[PDB]
RNA sequence: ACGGAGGGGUACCACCAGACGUGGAGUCUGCGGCUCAAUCUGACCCAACGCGCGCACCUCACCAGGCCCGGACGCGCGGAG
């Protein structure tokens, strides 16, 4: 599942995409949680997200298109289906967060 | 319609009887010409010329130079590595 409540937070937002986002949000930001891109590019770009969450909340899973799925960074048009490449994204981070349901 | 044709009428944007003026000098203002990078334009008998309701900026159109897109909306492409 874990497809309908991102969408709900996007409307306010709340996830960022890139690296300089997600450092800044990593640092000096309410950083819950993110679901990783999962090594992708490397796994030391992403080291360096586990080394500091484990070292300063967060895991991984393997589904990216789906992270940019929920995340409207896909050419969506008005008819509601799909049009672009879903724009594989990485930064996960969310922050107003405004699940339970798995946990 | 016109008549250096005829007959009736009329009005100080016609005259008689008079008055006050203008055109003469300096100046305010607008108008043609000359000039300039530009001296933004319209209107030329009555029926254009202190008229288009006060030009240091704006007004502002013209002259010499510099920021901005404030390119709505649909198709293809790219885009958060």
């Not at 930001?29 to 030391?44: G, N, V, W």
């Not at 969506?76 to 724009?87: E, M």
Request: hydrophobic residues 35%.
């Amino acid at each position: 599942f874990l497809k309908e409540t991102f969408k709900r937070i996007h409307n306010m937002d709340g996830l960022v995409t890139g690296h300089r986002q997600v450092f800044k949000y990593l640092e000096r930001k309410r950083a819950k949680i993110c679901f990783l891109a999962s090594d992708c590019e490397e796994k030391q770009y992403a080291d360096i997200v586990e080394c500091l969450c484990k070292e300063y909340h967060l895991c991984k899973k393997f589904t990216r298109r789906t992270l940019g799925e929920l995340t409207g960074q896909v050419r969506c048009l008005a008819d509601s289906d799909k049009i672009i490449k879903v724009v594989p994204a990485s930064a996960c981070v969310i922050h107003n967060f405004v699940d339970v349901d798995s946990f």
